Amino acid sequence: FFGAIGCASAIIFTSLGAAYGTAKSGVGICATCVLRPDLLFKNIVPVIMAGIIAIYGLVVSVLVCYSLGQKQALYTGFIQLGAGLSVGLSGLAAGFAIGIVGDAGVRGSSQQPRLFVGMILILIFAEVLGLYGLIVALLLNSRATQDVVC
Amino acid sequence: FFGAIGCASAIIFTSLGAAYGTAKSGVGICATCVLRPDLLFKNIVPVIMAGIIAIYGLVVSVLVCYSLGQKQALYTGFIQLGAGLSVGLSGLAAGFAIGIVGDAGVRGSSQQPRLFVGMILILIFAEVLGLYGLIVALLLNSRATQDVVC
Amino acid sequence: MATALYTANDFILISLPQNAQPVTAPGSKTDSWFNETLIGGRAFVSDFKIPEFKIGSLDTLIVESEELSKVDNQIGASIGKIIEILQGLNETSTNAYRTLPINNMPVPEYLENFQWQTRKFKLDKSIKDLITLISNESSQLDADVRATYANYNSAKTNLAAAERKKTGDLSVRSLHDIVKPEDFVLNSEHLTTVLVAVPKSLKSDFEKSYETLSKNVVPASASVIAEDAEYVLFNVHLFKKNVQEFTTAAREKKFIPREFNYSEELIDQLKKEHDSAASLEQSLRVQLVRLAKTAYVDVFINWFHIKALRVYVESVLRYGLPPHFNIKIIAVPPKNLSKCKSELIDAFGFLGGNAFMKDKKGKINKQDTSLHQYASLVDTEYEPFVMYIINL
Numbered sequence: 001f002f003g004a005i006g007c008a009s010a011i012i013f014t015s016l017g018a019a020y021g022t023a024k025s026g027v028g029i030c031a032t033c034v035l036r037p038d039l040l041f042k043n044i045v046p047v048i049m050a051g052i053i054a055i056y057g058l059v060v061s062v063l064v065c066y067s068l069g070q071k072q073a074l075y076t077g078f079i080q081l082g083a084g085l086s087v088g089l090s091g092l093a094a095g096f097a098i099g100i101v102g103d104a105g106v107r108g109s110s111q112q113p114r115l116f117v118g119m120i121l122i123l124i125f126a127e128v129l130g131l132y133g134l135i136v137a138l139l140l141n142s143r144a145t146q147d148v149v150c
Numbered sequence: 151f152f153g154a155i156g157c158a159s160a161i162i163f164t165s166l167g168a169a170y171g172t173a174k175s176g177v178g179i180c181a182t183c184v185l186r187p188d189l190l191f192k193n194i195v196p197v198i199m200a201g202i203i204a205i206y207g208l209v210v211s212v213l214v215c216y217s218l219g220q221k222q223a224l225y226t227g228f229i230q231l232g233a234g235l236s237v238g239l240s241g242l243a244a245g246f247a248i249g250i251v252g253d254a255g256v257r258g259s260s261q262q263p264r265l266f267v268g269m270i271l272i273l274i275f276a277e278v279l280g281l282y283g284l285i286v287a288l289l290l291n292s293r294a295t296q297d298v299v300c
Numbered sequence: 301m302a303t304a305l306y307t308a309n310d311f312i313l314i315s316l317p318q319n320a321q322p323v324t325a326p327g328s329k330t331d332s333w334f335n336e337t338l339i340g341g342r343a344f345v346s347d348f349k350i351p352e353f354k355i356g357s358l359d360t361l362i363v364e365s366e367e368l369s370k371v372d373n374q375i376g377a378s379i380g381k382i383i384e385i386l387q388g389l390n391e392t393s394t395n396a397y398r399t400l401p402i403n404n405m406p407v408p409e410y411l412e413n414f415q416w417q418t419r420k421f422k423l424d425k426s427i428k429d430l431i432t433l434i435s436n437e438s439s440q441l442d443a444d445v446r447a448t449y450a451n452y453n454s455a456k457t458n459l460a461a462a463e464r465k466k467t468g469d470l471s472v473r474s475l476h477d478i479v480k481p482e483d484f485v486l487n488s489e490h491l492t493t494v495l496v497a498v499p500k501s502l503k504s505d506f507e508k509s510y511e512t513l514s515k516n517v518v519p520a521s522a523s524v525i526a527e528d529a530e531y532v533l534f535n536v537h538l539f540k541k542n543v544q545e546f547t548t549a550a551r552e553k554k555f556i557p558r559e560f561n562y563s564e565e566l567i568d569q570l571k572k573e574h575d576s577a578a579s580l581e582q583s584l585r586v587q588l589v590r591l592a593k594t595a596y597v598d599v600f601i602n603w604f605h606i607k608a609l610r611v612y613v614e615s616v617l618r619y620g621l622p623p624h625f626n627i628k629i630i631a632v633p634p635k636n637l638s639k640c641k642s643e644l645i646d647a648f649g650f651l652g653g654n655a656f657m658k659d660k661k662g663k664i665n666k667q668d669t670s671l672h673q674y675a676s677l678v679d680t681e682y683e684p685f686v687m688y689i690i691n692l
Binding site for chain 1: 253254
């Protein structure tokens with residue numbers, strides 16, 4: 001019912017999130033590298049911020065799979081739903097944050113090698129959310145499975 | 151039924167993802183080909199990266215078909231619907247990201263031939279999102295295959 | 301760092317009073333400090349001390365500083381233009397002329413043997429004529445490089461033109477590579493030759509039509525004297541009256557006539573023109589590389605003398621006593637420039653005075669802003685002790 005759609009949401013939302021991040025940042029970086037090819041390594045570290053959202057997402061998703069297969073009812077379905085959404089929204093939203101900050105921060109990385117740590121720190125504030133989605137979800141998964149029950 | 155939609159999500163979305171990626175990549179590559187014509191082989195490496203997503207999607211879909219009975223259960227049904235979604239929307243998202251990064255990175259190819267691999271390192275980061283889809287969808291399929299026992 | 305690339309030895313020139321003490325390391329001498337303390341002990345410190353010359357007056361001291369600042373720029377402009385040329389041609393390393401040997405001795409070592417060098421410059425000449433002399437030599441050497449480079453571009457233009465005649469494309473191509481008496485007529489009262497540049501498709505059409513196209517045309521005169529890749533070149537023999545009628549009738553068909561008419565003196569003069577262009581460019585190129593290295597070593601010696609003189613003079617003006625000033629030139633390892641600039645500022649800046657002291661530390665090499673870059677010239681900020689940053 002909603003529980004399957006939970007699985008699904010987790011994967012839909014966080015993938016897209018991470019895409020958005022990678023695209024936005026990517027274009028800025030690709031452009032920048034032509035000035036100085038020495039910012040290769042620096043530049044990559046903003047892009048890898050959106051790569052980690054999804055891997056957390058896979059851990060919550062995989063759990064739900066094991067708890068699924070059987071015909072359930074309302075009780076399992078809604079608690080599985082809510083867990084999906086959690087990894088889903090953080091992935092989407094944090095993913096969104098990172099690409100914005102990332103692009104403008106490619107100018108920061110380029111001119112400032114010593115306020116580069118400052119640049120990480122802005123990005124690092126978005127990573128807080130990824131955690132929140134995930135921790136709440138993990139808790140949710142274990143509790144959700146009761147199987148059936150309207 | 152809900153099986154038909156499983157099939158639908160996975161093959162529509164991921165197909166468009168691949169199309170997006172190639173189109174976009176194309177526009178850059180064709181601008182760039184007049185400028186430097188022997189960097190063709192390198193140019194070519196991004197284009198094919200988005201193409202391999204589709205072939206995963208369509209395999210998931212052939213299975214999902216088989217897993218549809220005619221007994222009709224909402225909850226077995228929903229896992230197939232939910233399964234299709236996961237590779238669909240992840241596939242779309244990798245494709246959208248890959249064409250943007252792909253485009254911007256051919257400018258890189260032109261100016262800095264030597265450091266072409268830095269574009270690749272970026273691009274390949276949105277393949278994780280397909281793996282994440284693939285894995286989760288497969289399990290979900292496998293659970294589902296029962297020909298919707300009511 | 302990563303806001304600037306360095307891969308060649310960088311220099312900061314300091315001059316300080318010989319009674320000075322660093323407050324970043326109290327209990328040290330300035331000389332002992334440079335070697336041991338400064339950038340992790342990895343600073344190479346070189347001698348750069350020069351003695352007293354003859355100073356006009358205190359009054360004269362002022363006039364000298366102003367000129368020194370100006371001549372230093374101007375020589376700097378010249379040496380940059382010579383290096384840019386040698387680099388541009390890529391017949392000599394592009395990866396040197398920042399730490400390329402002067403007098404076949406490595407550049408940090410060259411400065412270490414630099415104590416006031418003699419080429420034409422002595423310590424018993426007056427300071428005003430050394431400022432003047434030096435600048436005149438630098439300007440002459442650069443003006444020479446500029447003229448020979450100017451000549452080398454006029455030579456490139458001539459070699460392309462001449463080549464095009466020798467085999468190019470028919471819209472200016474003049475013939476002298478074919479010299480046959482069977483494809484052209486000469487010593488002739490009634491006949492002349494008109495060359496017709498014909499598209500390759502249209503070659504068949506030309507072959508059929510030409511005899512009847514104008515009246516009074518030598519038949520079996522069609523021969524392919526030359527061919528390019530877009531056009532075919534034919535020779536036609538015809539009446540002098542009838543040449544006008546052929547050029548005009550041919551254009552209607554979409555043939556392009558090339559007005560050429562056989563004379564020996566034109567053919568010989570086209571071959572000579574091509575020959576002299578080649579010879580001129582080749583002589584100019586060798587002369588251009590030889591001249592640029594020789595001029596470069598002399599201007600390097602000239603430039604560092606103005607920097608040595610200047611730093612000493614500026615010290616004499618700002619500090620007065622001691623009459624001999626402790627000058628050292630420090631060769632900094634790549635990417636440790638930022639750290640170097642800061643440690644000296646902290647340590648010595650106090651001697652110049654608290655008013656003199658401003659914080660705008662940091663460095664932007666990109667054109668996003670023009671703050672954060674020291675120079676006493678600007679009112680925006682000032683150096684807080686006699687310090688020049690030298691970037692080759």
